[PDB]
Amino acid sequence: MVTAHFVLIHTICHGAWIWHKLKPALERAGHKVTALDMAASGIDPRQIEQINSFDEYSEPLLTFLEKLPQGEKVIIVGEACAGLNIAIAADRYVDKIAAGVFHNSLLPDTVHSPSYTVEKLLESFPDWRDTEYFTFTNITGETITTMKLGFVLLRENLFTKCTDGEYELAKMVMRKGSLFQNVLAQRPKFTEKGYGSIKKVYIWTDQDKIFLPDFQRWQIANYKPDKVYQVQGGDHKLQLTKTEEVAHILQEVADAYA
Amino acid sequence: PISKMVTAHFVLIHTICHGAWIWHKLKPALERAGHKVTALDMAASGIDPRQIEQINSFDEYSEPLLTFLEKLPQGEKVIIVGEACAGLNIAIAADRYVDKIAAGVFHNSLLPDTVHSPSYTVEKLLESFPDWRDTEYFTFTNITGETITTMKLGFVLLRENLFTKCTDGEYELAKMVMRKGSLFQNVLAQRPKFTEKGYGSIKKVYIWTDQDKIFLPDFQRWQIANYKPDKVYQVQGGDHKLQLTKTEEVAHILQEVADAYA
Amino acid sequence: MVTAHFVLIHTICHGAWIWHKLKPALERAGHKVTALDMAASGIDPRQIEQINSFDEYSEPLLTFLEKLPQGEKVIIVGEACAGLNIAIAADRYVDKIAAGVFHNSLLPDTVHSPSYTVEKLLESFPDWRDTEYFTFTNITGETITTMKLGFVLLRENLFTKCTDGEYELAKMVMRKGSLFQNVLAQRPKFTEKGYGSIKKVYIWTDQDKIFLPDFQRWQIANYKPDKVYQVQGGDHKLQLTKTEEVAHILQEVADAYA
Amino acid sequence: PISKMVTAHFVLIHTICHGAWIWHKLKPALERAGHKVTALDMAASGIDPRQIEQINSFDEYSEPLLTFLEKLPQGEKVIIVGEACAGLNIAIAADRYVDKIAAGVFHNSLLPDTVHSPSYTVEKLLESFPDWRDTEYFTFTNITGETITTMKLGFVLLRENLFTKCTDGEYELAKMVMRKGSLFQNVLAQRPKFTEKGYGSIKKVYIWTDQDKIFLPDFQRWQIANYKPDKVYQVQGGDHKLQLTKTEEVAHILQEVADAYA
Secondary structure (H helix, E strand, C coil): CCCCEEEEECCCCCCHHHHCCHHHHHHHCCCEEEEECCCCCCCCCCCHHHCCCHHHHCHHHHHHHHHCCCCCCEEEEEEHHHHHHHHHHHHHHHHHEEEEEEECCCCCCCCCCCCHHHHHHHHHCCCCCCCEEEEEECCCCCEEEEEECCHHHHHHHHCCCCCHHHHHHHHHHCCCEECCHHHHHCCCCCCCCCHHHCCEEEEECCCCCCCCHHHHHHHHHHCCCCEEEECCCCCCCHHHHCHHHHHHHHHHHHHHHC | CCCCCCCCEEEEECCCCCCHHHHCCHHHHHHHCCCEEEEECCCCCCCCCCCHHHCCCHHHHCHHHHHHHHHCCCCCCEEEEEEHHHHHHHHHHHHHHHHHEEEEEEECCCCCCCCCCCCHHHHHHHHHCCCCCCCEEEEEECCCCCEEEEEECCHHHHHHHHCCCCCHHHHHHHHHHCCCECCCHHHHHCCCCCCCCCHHHCCEEEEECCCCCCCCHHHHHHHHHHCCCCEEEECCCCCCCHHHHCHHHHHHHHHHHHHHHC | CCCCEEEEECCCCCCHHHHCCHHHHHHHCCCEEEEECCCCCCCCCCCHHHCCCHHHHCHHHHHHHHHCCCCCCEEEEEEHHHHHHHHHHHHHHHHHEEEEEEECCCCCCCCCCCCHHHHHHHHHCCCCCCCEEEEEECCCCCEEEEEECCHHHHHHHHCCCCCHHHHHHHHHHCCCEECCHHHHHCCCCCCCCCHHHCCEEEEECCCCCCCCHHHHHHHHHHCCCCEEEECCCCCCCHHHHCHHHHHHHHHHHHHHHC | CCCCCCCCEEEEECCCCCCHHHHCCHHHHHHHCCCEEEEECCCCCCCCCCCHHHCCCHHHHCHHHHHHHHHCCCCCCEEEEEEHHHHHHHHHHHHHHHHHEEEEEEECCCCCCCCCCCCHHHHHHHHHCCCCCCCEEEEEECCCCCEEEEEECCHHHHHHHHCCCCCHHHHHHHHHHCCCECCCHHHHHCCCCCCCCCHHHCCEEEEECCCCCCCCHHHHHHHHHHCCCCEEEECCCCCCCHHHHCHHHHHHHHHHHHHHHC
C-alpha cells in the first residue's frame, strides 16, 4: 500500500477549498497532499483581468512543480477544466509526474487543438443557465470572456447532491473565471513526449449534471485513458459527494504509479 | 397566554482573517427556520478583493457592513450576529445605523462598551491570551502614518485554539481560505468612544461557551461583568467556532433572539 | 556644501527615465540619488488596470521609504502630478523627509480635497489635444479614467524645448496613466501633521506650456511654499532643458534642509 | 555619370534586455535625412507588456517584427537594422518575409548563417566573451519543458563593456529601462537552420567597430570570415552602442545602404 504526494487542482472559478473533505481523507491513509489555488481563484490575490492565458492561470501549479525537489514525483488530480492544467504542466514537467488523474474532467489530447474538449463541452452543454459573462482585453489584444457561475447552475448542475452547507460554502467563495477558449484555440497542441506520455486515470459518474454522460463517454473514446473508474451516484463534485470513493481510487493510483 | 414566533433578517459578521465562509453551516440552518440571512465579507477578508495593507482602520475594514446597512429599505431592521473581533464591527455600525439594528448578538465575541476606549476589550483580550503561538506578524504604515500590525494565524493556533473540536473538513477548509488580518489596536486606541445614543442603546445578546480555547472563560466573564448584556446564553461544549460545532443550538438561541427583538 | 539623498519621482505615464540627465548631474556633486518607477510606469511590471488609487500608484515610493534605514532622511523631488505622491508619502513617513521639492508640479494643500489642484489644472488647461482616454472599473466599483498622452501634446506642451532625441525617447517608453481624480475627490485631506509640516520648495518656469503660468502662480498663492525658485526659459521638462539649473537649486535645498 | 540618393524605410531592432529606446538618437538622425523609421520593442523588452517567462523561443520573442512585416503594404520593402543579438531576429524574419526585406544591416551584431545551427554564432559569441561579469542568471521552464536561462545584465558590464564610451545620461538611461532577456540558446540549438531561399538570399551589410568591448574584434572578424557580408563598414572609435556614440556616421552608412538596396 503506497503512500504518495497528490497535488489537487480545482476547476475555474473555484479554489483549493473544493478539496477540503478529500485532503484529510487522503492524509488519513498517510499520503502527502498539496491543494493549490490557481491564479485569481480561491484566495489568490490576482484578479482574472490580469491573467492572459490558461498557461498563466496555471502558474501556481507550474511554480510548485518547478520547485519540487529532485527525484520527487506527484500525482496531479484535476477536476473539470483542470484537465487542461494537468496537460500544460505535464508538457513542462513530465518527469515529476507519476500520473495525472481526471475527476469529471476535460481530457485533452495531442492530436487536436488545446481548445478541442472545451468546444466539445460547450456543444454537449450549451446553456449555463444563470451564469453571467464579461470580457476584457488581455495584454496582447485578445478579448477574453470571463463568467460568474450562476447560483441555479451551481445548485442544480455542479453541486446537485451536495449538502446545503457545501452548496452555501460554494456561493460564499466562488470567483470569476475563464476558459481562455480562443487563446487555447491559438495554442500549440500538447506534446506527445510530455502530456502524451503521462499515465492517465479517469474518474467520473454518469450522474454528473454538467459534464454529461455522452460527453464523458466521447472523451474516453476519443483518447483512451490507462484506467477509467466509474463511481455510482454522486454528482459533478465527487470529492464532496463520494469522498471516500475518490480516496480509495486514488489509493489504487498510488499503488499503481507510486 | 400568547406565544410569539418571529422571522428575522440576520446579518452574520466573521472575525479578522476569516470571511463569510465560516457561516456556511449556520446560514442554511437559519434559512430552514425561515429567516433571511446575509453573510458578508469584511474588507480584505474571504474573497473580498482588497488586501489588508490598503485598509487603514477597523472602520474602513467595516465598510461592507456599513454599505449594506446604508442600502437597507426603509424600516427594515436586522439582527447583526458577530463572532470574536466582530463585536467591534457591531459597535461601529450601531453608531451609524442604530435605527436599522433590532439587536446585536456577540458570539464568543469582543463586547465593546461606551465608557472606555474602543481598543479596551482588545487590550484585555491580549492580556488574557498573550501568546498566539505560531501566528506570524507583519506591519505596514497606514494613510496617516500609524504602523499597523497584521497577522497570519498559525495553523496550530487554528487547530487547537480556534477550531478545537471542529471536523477535519472544517479545519482543512479554514487553512484553505484564511487571510491576513489586523486588530488595528493602536488606531482603535485613537478612536472616539462608542456612543450611548447609537451603540449604547442597542439590545445585546452574548452567546459563549466556557470550552472556548482562545476567548477564555476569565476574559468572557470579565466582559459580561464589564458591560452587562441584555441576555447571556452559555452553550455547553463546542469550541470557539460555535457556529460550526453547535450549529443547531446557535440557530435555536438565534430564534429566541428573533422572538424577543424581531 | 551638503550632500543629500534625493528620491526623484516622475509624473503619470512617464517613468524614472525622465531623470536620466539630472541623476548623473546630482551624483557629480556627491549626492546619492534614487529614481523610482511608480506602479505601471517606466518598466514597472504592473498594468494601470490593476492600480486602484493614487495611493496604490505611489506604492514604489511608500515601500522605499518604508525600508529607508532608521535615522536617514531624503529630499523627494516630484514633477507635475508627482506633487500628489509627495503629499501621500509625507503623511505616512514625515520623519524620513528632509524636504519635498515641486518641479513644475501640482502643489496639494491640507484645506481642500486631494483632487483640488487636479481640478484647477484641468480648468487652466482643459484640452489635452491628441491625448486619448479609456476607463476600467477598479476593484471597488469606481470607473477610473486612463489616458495615453498624445504625441502633439508631448512635442508642443510637455517637451516643448527638448531635443529631438529626448522627445523621441519619450515616445519610445511612455505608458498609460491616470489622475484617479474621482478617487482623490473621495480621499481624506492631507494632514497638517504630515504633509502640512514638511519643508516645501517650488521650482517652475513661466515657459511651461501645460502647467501654465497663471495656474502655477495660483498654486503658490494658494499654499505658499517655504521657497520658490523660478528658472528662466526651458519648458515643462526642466530636468532635461535646464538640468544644471535644477541640480544647482537642489544643491541649495540640500544645504538648507540637509 | 548618374548619381542616385534614395529614402528608405528602416526598421530598427534592439538586442535582448533592451528596447526601442536605444535608437532614440539614430531614429531622428535618419528622419532628418528624410527616411521613414520604425523602432520596435521585441517581446518582453522596452515597454512591451509581456514578461520574459511567458516567451518560449527567439521566434516568439521576434513576434513584434513578424507582425509588423505581416502588416506592411503590398510591395513595400524595409531595411531591417539590428544590433547585437538582433541578427537572429533578422534571420527569423527573412525566412518569413524575404520579399519585404530590401537588405539586413547587422550593427555589432550576431551574423547567423544557413550552414550551421541557428545557435552557432551564440556558441561562438560566448566562447569569445564567456564572463559577463556581474550579470545575474535565472531560469524558467518553457511550454515544452526546455529550461531557459534569462539574465539581468550587470551594471559594470553595462558601463564598461556595452556603453563603454556613452554619456552619463545615456548610461543612466540604460540602467533605468533595461529588462531581463534570454539568448534562448538551447531552443535555437533545436531549431531548423535558416534557409537559403529566405535568409540566405537577402543583402547583408555588416557595420562594426573594433573598439567594441563585448562583441570583440576576434569574434566580429570570425563572423565576417564565416559568412561574408555583401558590404562591411568598419567605424573607427565609438563602442558597442554605435547608434549612440557614432550616431551620425551610422546614419551616413545607412544612407549608403539605402542608395544601394533602396
